[PDB]
């Protein structure tokens, strides 16, 4: 159906959004310090490792909130040419862990370069805090890579399944075909897919090229006071930001909840 976001979700959906926007800050990744404009909000977390992989420029980080009993994994969106050209290399390629599935190559390539050194901290981190949960967040490409990760992590069958893995993305592009959208639903991993007003990104690559989203769509429809509408299907639906097309925006994609997501502004 369609229902509306309870002030709680809304409040939780902004926190993931702040982690996502602070990641565009050179002092977080890779300074690895909470010295940014909306850094006091997340300053209680211990940053555990930061990465800036060389070919694709993938920027991600692992942090721990012990007050929150959470293990955070965060990836940054496009900030450099190497991110933009990945962004553009969308030929669908095969989805290795799941036969019959296809995913946008650039996005795959981008996670494949940080993947390993990243999956090994989380696990290290979790082997010592088996009771904490894992929240994975990301903006625009970051959301794309944040998706593949949660998947890589649920696949290593290491204690992580649906009751302790959470996914939050913001203005996230589509990642793979209808079969991939489908397999994502299967994991049952909890996935909050936020889209701000007219934002374009969530609309690219185009569905006709064989791209379909998975994820409960939290569509922000007004900003003051904030209002979010939730379309509870798990696969893409024609009733949240899909109905405002073709009147899309770029501005709308750089601001979620009042926070600048892109510029570290």
UniProtKB/Swiss-Prot annotation:
Q: Which reaction does it catalyse?
A: a triacylglycerol + H2O = a diacylglycerol + a fatty acid + H(+)
* Active-site residues, record numbering mapped to chain: 140, 199, 253
Gene Ontology terms describing biological process: lipid catabolic process
Which leading EC class covers this enzyme? hydrolase
Q: What is its EC number?
A: 3.1.1.3
GO terms of molecular function: metal ion binding; triacylglycerol lipase activity
Binding locations of Ca(2+) = 252
Listed disulfide bonds for this chain? 25-264, 36-39, 231-240
Keyword annotations from UniProtKB, A to Z: Calcium, Disulfide bond, Hydrolase, Lipid degradation, Lipid metabolism, Metal-binding, Signal, Zymogen
- Which family is annotated? Belongs to the AB hydrolase superfamily. Lipase family.
Name under which the protein is recorded: Lipase
């Amino acid at each position: 159906g369609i229902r509306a976001a309870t002030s709680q979700e809304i409040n939780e959906l902004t926190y993931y959004t702040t982690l996502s926007a602070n990641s565009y800050c050179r002092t977080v990744i890779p300074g690895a310090t909470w010295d940014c404009i909306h850094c006091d909000a997340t300053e209680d977390l211990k940053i555990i490792k930061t990465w800036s992989t060389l070919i694709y420029d993938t920027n991600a980080m692992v942090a721990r909130g012990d007050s929150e009993k959470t293990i955070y994994i965060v990836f940054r969106g496009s900030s450099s040419i190497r991110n933009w050209i990945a962004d553009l290399t969308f030929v669908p390629v095969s989805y290795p862990p799941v036969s019959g599935t296809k995913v946008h190559k650039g996005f795959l390539d981008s996670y494949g370069e940080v993947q390993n050194e990243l999956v090994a901290t989380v696990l290290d981190q979790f082997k010592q805090y088996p009771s904490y949960k894992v929240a994975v967040t990301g903006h625009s490409l970051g959301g794309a890579t944040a998706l593949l990760c949660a998947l890589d992590l649920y696949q290593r069958e290491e204690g992580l399944s649906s009751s302790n893995l959470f996914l939050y993305t913001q203005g996230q592009p589509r990642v793979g075909n209808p079969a991939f959208a489908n397999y994502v639903v299967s994991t049952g991993i909890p996935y909050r897919r936020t889209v701000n007003e007219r934002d374009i990104v969530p609309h690219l690559p185009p569905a006709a090229f064989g791209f379909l989203h998975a994820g409960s769509e939290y569509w922000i429809t007004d900003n003051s006071p904030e209002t979010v509408q939730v379309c509870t299907s798990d696969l893409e639906t024609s009733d949240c930001s899909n109905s405002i097309v073709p009147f899309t925006s770029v501005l709308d994609h750089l601001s979620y909840f009042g926070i600048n997501t892109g510029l570290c502004t």
